[PDB]
Design a protein around this ligand. Structure first.
Ligand SMILES: CCc1c(O)cc(O)c(C(=O)c2ccc(OCCN3CCOCC3)c(OC)c2)c1CC(=O)N(CCOC)CCOC
Length: 211
């Protein structure tokens, strides 16, 4: 019931670089995940133009940011197009991406890690701040799946039994011990304002009552 997959070698190499390189500007992970959510929302909106029943799984197009200081998790959920199981396996770890090698070669030539999203691999910037990432996703054409990886060269995929999501993708960042600033309301607001000011979907930052 839990399938384990190896990352393609260049993706494993990229994840190691992101994990081991000294780089203080870690807040760009949030811009990259919000960007991915925006792209997925653009896609379901586009498909709904010619087939409105594709919104039968939910008409609201939005992005929610949910910090949990108890679990030490930051969750990003969107109601975009979501991913099939094949989407997860093909595009979240087993296949090359010409952008993966291009990015590592650009880094070799002096580029900055913050350029990662130009190479189509911005998701992996999550590993700047997370020791483990869980991705829960639901596409209209498939069931709900959970992808998960703590790097180390492998990821798992399983059918997900948790709260049904309707449609979309939820990224759960299990934060590293020294990266808990990204659970603070003021810090998240600062990052969204700086980097995601023009995203064309409502971004709601959930709050927590103190301890
Ligand atoms: C976990 C990262 C993430 C996220 O944080 C929030 C999200 O909502 C989703 C999505 O569900 C999503 C679904 C479809 C998308 O676009 C389909 C068409 N395009 C055409 C060009 O070529 C690619 C597909 C898409 O665009 C960003 C995102 C994802 C997944 C994701 O970003 N992926 C890109 C690769 O990451 C390394 C995986 C996409 O597999 C389909």
């Amino acid at each position: 019931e839990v399938e384990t997959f190896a990352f393609q070698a260049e993706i494993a190499q990229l994840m190691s670089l992101i994990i081991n390189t000294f780089y203080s500007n870690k807040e760009i992970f949030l811009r990259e995940l919000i960007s991915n959510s925006s792209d997925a929302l653009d896609k379901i909106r586009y498909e709904s133009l010619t087939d409105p029943s594709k919104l039968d799984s939910g008409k609201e197009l939005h992005i929610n940011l949910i910090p949990n200081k108890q679990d030490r998790t930051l969750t990003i959920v969107d109601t975009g197009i979501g991913m099939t199981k094949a989407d997860l396996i093909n595009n979240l770890g087993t296949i090359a991406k010409s952008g993966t090698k291009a990015f590592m070669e650009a880094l070799q030539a002096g580029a900055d890690i913050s350029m990662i999203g130009q190479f189509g691999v911005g998701f992996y910037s999550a590993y700047l701040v997370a020791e483990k990432v869980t991705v829960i996703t639901k596409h209209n054409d498939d069931e709900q799946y959970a992808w998960e990886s703590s790097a180390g060269g492998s990821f798992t995929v399983r059918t997900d039994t948790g709260e049904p999501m309707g449609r979309g993708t939820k990224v759960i960042l299990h934060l590293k011990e020294d990266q808990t600033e990204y659970l603070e309301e003021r810090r998240i607001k600062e990052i969204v304002k700086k980097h995601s000011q023009f995203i064309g979907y409502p971004i709601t930052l959930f709050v927590e009552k103190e301890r």
